Amino acid sequence: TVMRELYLIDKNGYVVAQTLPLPKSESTAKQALEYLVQGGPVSEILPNGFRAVLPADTTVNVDIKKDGTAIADFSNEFKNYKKEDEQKIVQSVTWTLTQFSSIDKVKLRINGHELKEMPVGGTPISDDLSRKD
Ligand code: NA
Ligand code: NA
Ligand code: NA
Ligand code: NA
Ligand code: NA
Ligand code: NA
Ligand code: NA
Ligand code: NA
Ligand code: NA
Ligand code: NA
Ligand code: NA
Secondary structure: OEEEEEEEEOOOOOEEEEEEEEOOOOOHHHHHHHOOEOOOHHHHHOOOOOEOOEOOOOOEEEEEOOOOEEEEEEOHHHHOOOHHHHHHHHHHHHHHHHOOOOOOEEEEEEOOEEOOEOOOOOOEOOOOEOOOO
16 A cells, blocks of 8 residues: 545544555556545545545546646536535645645546536636645
8 A cells, every 4th residue: 555645524524634545556646536535445444533525426537737737527426515515625636636746736627528616506716726725
């Protein structure tokens, strides 16, 4: 296994970094996002009191560009979150991706559509989400 940060939601509802041991992978950014999905492989290794963040059955493609941007393009299930978790989800995805050496910012898509706003509640989002946010 390899130590990775997963930005999970704790017993008090906060998005908090947790270090988990993930199997070795040739697509580590995608893998880390797969370990944020409710009901996915993180389920067996969640630390006490923590939960996963992305809706069940969400899948994703991560395309890492030469400028440091990771384009994370989610399946339609990604729309199935609770409104009030909208910004926590953006933060979790952003912080989880930007741990990697080749990613310093994030752009979100759903079903290959570019996102100006998150779908459930309309939170505006830029194409250069980063830890500065
Ligand atoms: Na905590
Ligand atoms: Na809270
Ligand atoms: Na890994
Ligand atoms: Na592997
Ligand atoms: Na693996
Ligand atoms: Na990789
Ligand atoms: Na907790
Ligand atoms: Na779910
Ligand atoms: Na890069
Ligand atoms: Na509401
Ligand atoms: Na980085």
